[PDB]
């Protein structure tokens, strides 16, 4: 029962600040540390800093210079600052409980940040139905192509999330600055289209959801 | 600052075997290492604490051990389920570090490829693009090759690939390849194929359609 969830920007342009809040329940800010750790496009994690139960603050020296690290004990919330953000400051960022004044126990699910000049796209979401009766297999595989946005992510569930079993969503490639993933779901013949399948795409830096039913082709 | 080094970067094993991930320290007079799970595409969780310490329901099987340098996260017993990447926390001195991480990676039985086709939707017509796209799904090793043939001749222009990580269910890998052409292109040719080359078979595995059918 001790959740962290950060809630940030999922854009920022080159320069400005990042803030990020960390909501906690199952703890009290006043008994335990939280750190804020970033991990950016395949490198190592890094700790950017930490603050303890009784409110002390201590940054990695790399990041001294424009971090800061607050926090509002009513509301249980961690906040990050980060001045003059370039483009390497790019990562998924997360908080983190200690256990007191020692080991991180908790992590949070992590917040994307895309440091970038560009503008938010919302990706146009595409079914991708079987071609002409291509055959009876006992299974059917389907899709939705999600392309053409900015930055990542988005979530792809199937049927709200009803559908888990047999997909596969593969990580998104970035082609002339936007964008494009897939994702399969494969489901049983008989089941397919009488029962409906839909993928659901958010793509939370332009709050934007699109739900796109599968019908089969009229080709 | 201290720096935890992890020198495999990827690590080989099989259902039931046992694997050590190591984590060899630049410093220490220490205990105060942790270590963590990371599966893909969510957040750590600590299996490890000071060293030789496990965290509440981390299953029996994981353990740590060691001093000052150097440091061992053992899983008996692998499981599917095990797959992630393991990697150690450094909380003896400011700033906290971590090691780069070793990827846990299953053997399993070889397997073949699903593999299906799908042309450009009518939606995505209308608005001028047109991807085709091929899902090879479930198959093991990794090792795969797509080739994309239109009227029967090679374009490798315009093809982009994404693998997902190993599941953590049947251990296999799957792969999709997307042929991005204009509408324009699209519309001058009848015939698209992808083709999968898998260890499985000598044969490549065949997927096409007509434009015009
Ligand atoms: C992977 O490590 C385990 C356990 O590691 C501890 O002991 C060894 C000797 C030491 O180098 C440190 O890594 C650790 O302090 C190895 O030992 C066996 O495995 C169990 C745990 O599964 C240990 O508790 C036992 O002591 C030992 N078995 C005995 C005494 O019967 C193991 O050899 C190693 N495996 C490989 C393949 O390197």
């Known amino acids: 029962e001790v959740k962290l969830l950060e809630s940030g920007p999922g854009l920022v342009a080159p320069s400005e600040s990042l803030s990020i809040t960390c909501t906690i329940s199952?703890?009290?800010?006043?008994?335990?540390?939280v750190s804020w750790i970033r991990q950016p496009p395949g490198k190592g994690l890094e700790w950017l800093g930490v603050?303890?139960?009784?409110?002390?603050?201590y940054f990695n020296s790399l990041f001294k210079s424009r971090l800061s690290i607050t926090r509002d004990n009513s509301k249980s919330q961690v906040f990050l600052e980060m001045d003059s953000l370039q483009t390497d400051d790019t990562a998924m960022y997360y908080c983190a409980k200690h256990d007191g004044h020692e080991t991180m126990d908790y992590w949070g699910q992590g917040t994307s940040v895309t440091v970038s000049s560009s503008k938010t796209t919302p990706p146009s979401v595409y079914p991708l139905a079987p071609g002409s009766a291509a055959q009876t297999n006992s299974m059917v595989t389907l899709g939705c192509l999600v392309k053409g946005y900015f930055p990542e992510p988005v979530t792809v569930t199937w049927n709200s999330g009803s559908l888990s079993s047999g997909v596969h969503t593969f990580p998104a490639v970035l082609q002339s600055d936007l964008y494009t993933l897939s994702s399969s779901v494969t489901v049983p013949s008989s089941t397919w289209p009488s029962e409906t399948v839909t993928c659901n795409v958010a793509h939370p830096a332009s709050s934007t959801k699109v739900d796109k039913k599968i019908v089969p082709r009229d080709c | 600052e201290i720096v935890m080094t992890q020198s495999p970067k990827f690590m080989s094993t099989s259902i039931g075997d046992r694997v050590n991930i190591t984590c060899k320290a630049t410093?220490?007079?220490?205990?105060?290492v942790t270590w963590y799970q990371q599966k893909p595409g969510q957040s750590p969780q600590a299996l490890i604490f000071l060293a030789s310490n496990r965290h509440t329901g981390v299953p029996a099987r994981f353990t740590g051990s060691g001093s000052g340098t150097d440091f061992t996260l053992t899983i008996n017993n692998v499981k599917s389920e095990d797959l992630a990447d393991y990697f150690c926390?450094?909380?003896?001195?400011?700033?906290?570090?971590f090691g780069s991480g070793t990827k846990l990676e299953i053997k399993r039985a070889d397997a073949a490829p699903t593999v299906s086709i799908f042309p450009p939707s009518s939606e995505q017509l209308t608005s001028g693009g047109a991807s085709v796209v091929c899902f090879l799904n479930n198959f093991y090793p990794k090792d795969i090759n797509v080739k994309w043939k239109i009227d029967g001749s090679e374009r490798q222009n315009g093809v982009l690939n994404s693998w997902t990580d190993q599941d953590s269910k049947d251990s296999t890998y799957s792969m999709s390849s997307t042929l991005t052409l204009t509408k324009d292109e699209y519309e001058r040719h009848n015939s698209y194929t992808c083709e999968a080359t898998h260890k499985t078979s000598t044969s490549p595995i065949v997927k096409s359609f007509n434009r015009n059918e």
């Open positions: 410093q220490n007079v220490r205990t105060a």
């Open positions: 199952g703890f009290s800010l006043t008994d335990d540390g």
């Open positions: 926390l450094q909380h003896w001195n400011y700033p906290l570090t």
């Open positions: 603050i303890w139960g009784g409110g002390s603050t």
